[PDB]
């Protein structure tokens, strides 16, 4: 067979140890999920420095904690806008997930609080910026570079899926690089606890699995499809399915045809054909062998999964870092003061936050 006796015994023991780790992590998650934390700080505990990102949600600012001097990223949400945008459940869900999970590649929520006008989530500051920016600048990542990031996503999804969480929002825009060159996942608004199937149309066109586009009930296998898109885009510099308009992207996604750059290795093409598999009965991550079909694929043969988890692998790329509070890996945004109304807005809706 492919493995001699020593290699087969080592792989078997390793897979059993994963099961043991995940069973304990689920126990710890469910304790925190059932008893969340709240009201662990207030606004005048921090100096606000610079906007790091903006969206329909609100904005994220670099802040400095007065007592400790530590820097953090503070997400500020306007309650009235969250309601108008129909995002109450997503916002409460994001906070509940973030306070309950624990994994080296998931961003840590350090504080949360609210006032008359806004909701606040204070997360560790990840100074390296978005993977998106580095990828467009460099052009593409080498296969070893892409593989180092991919391994972290595989382990992160193995963790989340064991908790029955589907992620649904994978793309380079949503992945940050930390000071040691490792990945941080931050956004959980679209994540959902689902043991079986769910039906919401959500995600980003280039990264949508066919069964979402086709308005089917779907499961955690959509995350393994999206991993295939991410690996492709990291290694090529562009995604596998693109066009001028989303409907044309969707036609390509559901077609079952994908084409590769000539510089892709055969091992990479084989993995990607098995992740970008339209037939759910054949997609890696969705078979009897589960995540092991991915982790044991030839393209990952040089990956030491425990060493990645322990953060003992030397990263291929370390972002520029001039000191704490350095914001040079993020964009510049028009600053806008944060007003707090004399009148509480939307109290009932956000009573659990």
């Amino acid at each position: 067979g492919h493995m001699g006796n020593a290699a087969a015994a080592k792989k078997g023991s390793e897979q059993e140890s994963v099961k043991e780790f995940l069973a304990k992590a689920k126990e710890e998650f469910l304790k925190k999920w059932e008893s969340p934390s709240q009201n662990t700080a207030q606004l005048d505990h921090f100096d606000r420095i610079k906007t790091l990102g903006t969206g329909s949600f609100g904005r994220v600012m670099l802040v400095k904690h007065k007592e400790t001097g530590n820097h953090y990223a503070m997400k500020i949400l306007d309650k009235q806008k969250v309601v108008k945008l129909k995002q109450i459940e997503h916002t409460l869900n994001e906070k509940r997930i973030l306070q309950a999970v624990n994994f080296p590649f998931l961003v840590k929520l350090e504080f949360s609080f609210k006032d008359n006008s806004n909701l606040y989530m204070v997360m560790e500051y990840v100074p390296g910026g978005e993977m998106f920016s580095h990828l467009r600048r460099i052009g593409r990542f080498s296969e070893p570079h892409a593989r180092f990031y991919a391994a972290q996503i595989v382990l992160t999804f193995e963790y989340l899926h064991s908790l029955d969480l589907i992620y649904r929002d994978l793309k380079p825009e949503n992945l940050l690089i930390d000071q040691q060159g490792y990945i941080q996942v931050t956004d959980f608004g679209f994540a959902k606890r689902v043991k079986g199937r769910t039906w919401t149309l959500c995600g980003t066109p280039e990264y949508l699995a066919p069964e979402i586009i086709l308005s089917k009930g779907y499961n955690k296998a959509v995350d393994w499809w999206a991993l295939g898109v991410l690996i492709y885009e990291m290694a090529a510099g562009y995604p596998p399915f693109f066009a001028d308009q989303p409907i044309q992207i969707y036609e390509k996604i559901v077609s079952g045809k994908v084409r590769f750059p000539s510089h892709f290795s055969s091992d990479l093409k084989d993995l990607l054909r098995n992740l970008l598999q339209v037939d759910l009965t054949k997609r890696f991550g969705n078979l009897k062998n589960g995540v092991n079909d991915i982790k044991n694929h030839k393209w990952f043969a040089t990956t030491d999964w425990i060493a990645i988890y322990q953060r003992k692998v030397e990263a291929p790329f370390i972002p520029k870092f001039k000191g704490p509070g350095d914001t040079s890996n993020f964009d510049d945004y028009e600053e806008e003061e944060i007003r707090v109304s004399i009148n509480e807005k939307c109290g009932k809706e956000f009573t659990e936050f």
């Binding site: 329909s56 998106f132 959500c202 980003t204 562009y238 693109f242 066009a243 001028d244 750059p261």
Partner: peptide, 20 residues
């Protein structure tokens, strides 16, 4: 080239989710 087609798509910047 495929790269040229990607530039021509106009979707080289940050991509929004559907709900936006």
């Amino acid at each position: 080239t495929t790269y040229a087609d990607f530039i021509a798509s106009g979707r080289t910047g940050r991509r929004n989710a559907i709900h936006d």
